[model samples]
Target: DVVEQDKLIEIRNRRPAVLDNVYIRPALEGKRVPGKVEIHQNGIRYQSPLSTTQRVDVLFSNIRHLFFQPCQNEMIVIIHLHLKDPILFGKKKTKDVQFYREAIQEERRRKAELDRLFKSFAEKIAEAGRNEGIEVDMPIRDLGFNGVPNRSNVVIYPTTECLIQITEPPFLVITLEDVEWAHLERVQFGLKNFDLVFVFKDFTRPVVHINTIPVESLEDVKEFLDSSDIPFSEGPLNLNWSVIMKTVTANPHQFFLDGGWGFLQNDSRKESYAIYVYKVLKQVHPDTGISSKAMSIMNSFVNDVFERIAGEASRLAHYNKRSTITSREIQTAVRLLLPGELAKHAVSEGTKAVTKYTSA
Candidate 1:
């Protein structure tokens, strides 16, 4: 080779080969590398480079070369061939789809177990009640409130409201003892629920429902009384449904009046309600469902009927300056308390229920 007067030598930028050590030993010998880890560097930084020690601070620029190791051939190999930048602090976004499914199944199981427990408890209580002369009864047949001529046959007596509840929004309503009736001002029915109001006609005194809880025939009331946990008297013996029915039929005036009152039941009456058969069928067919829309409509009607009862009851019970309130006052209370859909339902029903709603 001839030497040139001006010559330049070129160097190549070559990276070291990765060192592969298949060595996995329980006790690591001196200078031995670990197994199966393919050491590499990605040459990236997610954060600012920081240095502390005086020696490291001086040699920090050379840290990039630290991610390397020797190969089987004793050649200088790079370990930092795939090094990556530091990651900032944050939580990872991941989902456990199976966990959701498991949670739902667990909830359903718990619900089924709870339902079984409640049913058993209720049956036990019912049996004990019967043995102890406590008859919680649903009748085989009940006089429907809608019956025309028989309407007068439904027995009722003046009784103080057993309790008051102000829990519902906007108004106060009351429940009658022994009877399933509740007093409300205005009632409305919706798709799956119903609403009612507590309307006040007078501020002076309290009024209460005068209507009797409807019963079939006469002696049904006796059955009702016998079944009730509350202590009551039937004058003498625990009369059958027939005797109670006959007594109330004979005493029509005993139940008629309006003030602080309204009544409602799962059905319009225990016997004659149109949907009663459907309910029974549904009970038998537990797998079948009555749609939410149907129940809501039913609730709305029930709620509306009772609203009027409550308004009238309150008017009658309150002590106005006039002492006793007139039916006209009851009518006025009904109107005042009613609103929206319930009000509309009340007006429609009242038109049929009362001949002349107002006098003044």
Candidate 2:
């Protein structure tokens, strides 16, 4: 009878480990939902208690970083997970997920329980991955600073390779490598706070901002930015990014021509021409100073007249089948290209310059 009972019993050993009473604040929905996280052999899963259909499964291969942010004198304990690619939840794409619990009251006991829960959950997930040879890394966090990202006052922490915020909805996990440059605004004297802007390499993506940072942490922020080798600049006032970006996108050539990169150290050719025009005007009038716009207009007129004359001369040369153009062609070209008195004065000047060159 004992052997027959033993033969009838079958063992089922493959089952996922579960943790209860965790919460996920969906980025798009902006609502907190209670759920239980499951640690499977190949992935992690979150199942909502209210609905059977509401579940999120993240494979271990897709996990970029698993961050454990304990309650550091805070009211919440969080486990933030950064993904290599965004996963869709409720028809919205989410790049990061936060599983946290709140310590509403009983500060010491609740905080300790939350902390222990976080540690045990993290360890269980780590242990589950051991069979698959997947190692979960918990990156070290830097000294956190306070800033308002997306209009929410939150503590932004810098980890080894990312800048993250786990305390609030719309959690941020910006990979430092994807950042193109950083812009620091409202950096003038007597200002209590400043804003930091992050521009990414992909133009289609909108820029990110962390504003209202305390002026005291300016040095610390700068140090971190410098250490990451991200180029940064400070300005006294906020820039109108819409207009700036519109202009940049409309004419990138003119944008770069205006020294958009800021490293072209020499004066522009137009400025040099204006300087020469001012010097010549000083010699003639002795007291006249030309406005830049006026100088530009004059330069443009000169270039237009010169190009017309040269084009006519070249046409005459081509018509005559001559190997090279002579002064007579230019004189005739100038007379054809310019108005009566202007033509006469220009011809006379050209004749004088030719005579001087021949004589010398």
Question: Could you tell me every candidate's TM-score relative to the true structure?
Answer: 0.17, 0.61
**Candidate 1's TM-score:** 0.17
TM-score of 2: 0.61
Off by over 4 Å in 1: 1-312, 315-317, 321-327, 340-345, 356-360
The digit string of per-residue lDDT tens for model 2 on 1-360 reads 011111111113755677778888573343566788887656788888667767777766666777787885777787877777777777766777778887774577768877888978877766765654444444355557889988778888888777888677767778899997787877767779988888776645677889999998898999989998998767554554544455456655644443342221111211113334444664687544454346546666766776778789899999999979899899999888779998899889999999999999
Candidate 2 segments whose C-alpha is farther than 4 A from its true place: 1-12, 27-33, 105-110, 126-142, 243-360
Worst 10 residues of 2 by lDDT: 1-10
| Weakest ten-residue segment in model 1 by summed lDDT | 94-103
Q: Positional deviation of 243 in candidate 2, in angstroms?
A: 4.3
Error of 1 at 88 (Å): 99
